[PDB]
Design an enzyme around this catalytic site. Sequence first.
Site: not given
Length: 245
Positions: A57, A102, A193, A195-196
């Site tokens: 995403h 994801d 954290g 994203s990814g």
Amino acid sequence: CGVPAIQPVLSGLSRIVNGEEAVPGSWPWQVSLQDKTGFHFCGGSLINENWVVTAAHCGVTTSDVVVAGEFDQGSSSEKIQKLKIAKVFKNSKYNSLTINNDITLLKLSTAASFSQTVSAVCLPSASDDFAAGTTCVTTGWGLTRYTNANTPDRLQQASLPLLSNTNCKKYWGTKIKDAMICAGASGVSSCMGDSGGPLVCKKNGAWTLVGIVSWGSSTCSTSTPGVYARVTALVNWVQQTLAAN
């Protein structure tokens, strides 16, 4: 893989609220995605010098660029690598509503030069089993999404534990799928954290990528867990892709 040149120092403060700063270079497979305009918008992991794991995403495209060997996102002194992506591989199974599956790989144009501060994480085997209750670490500049609100331009870290997909459910009910994995709840946020971003675990002396910042607590609550890409579940994919390219 997963044996930093600069072994990271994790205090207990790493276990509460919003974690703690990280020793610069303490996490080398750790990258940032910047767009054209250069907006650090996502997080990633060097699994090699040619590839980057990431969250589906994040909808990254070849327009973005991978930043490497960074520490404090507000520094020009950095001896950082800015890398171009050649091609971009979103897992075909990526569900957009549930955000289950994801994951997506980044095969770069030019290959990143590893280094002390530049290297890769280790990947689990589908077979791997990171028990519930495992202490893991998530790092990033997620808290920086606080533009007027902040924390550190500098990479933060945090120590949270693995969850049963069930107990996780007790928090997000069904949102939670078989390919997800949650960590958190222990009275410390996870919004650090990106994203990814990575959620790694030690074992057998190495930091192995266990999951990937998918999403979590609208309010960064310390009582809410984080959701991640259940890497184990997502690994064959990886491998497969990795081969065929």
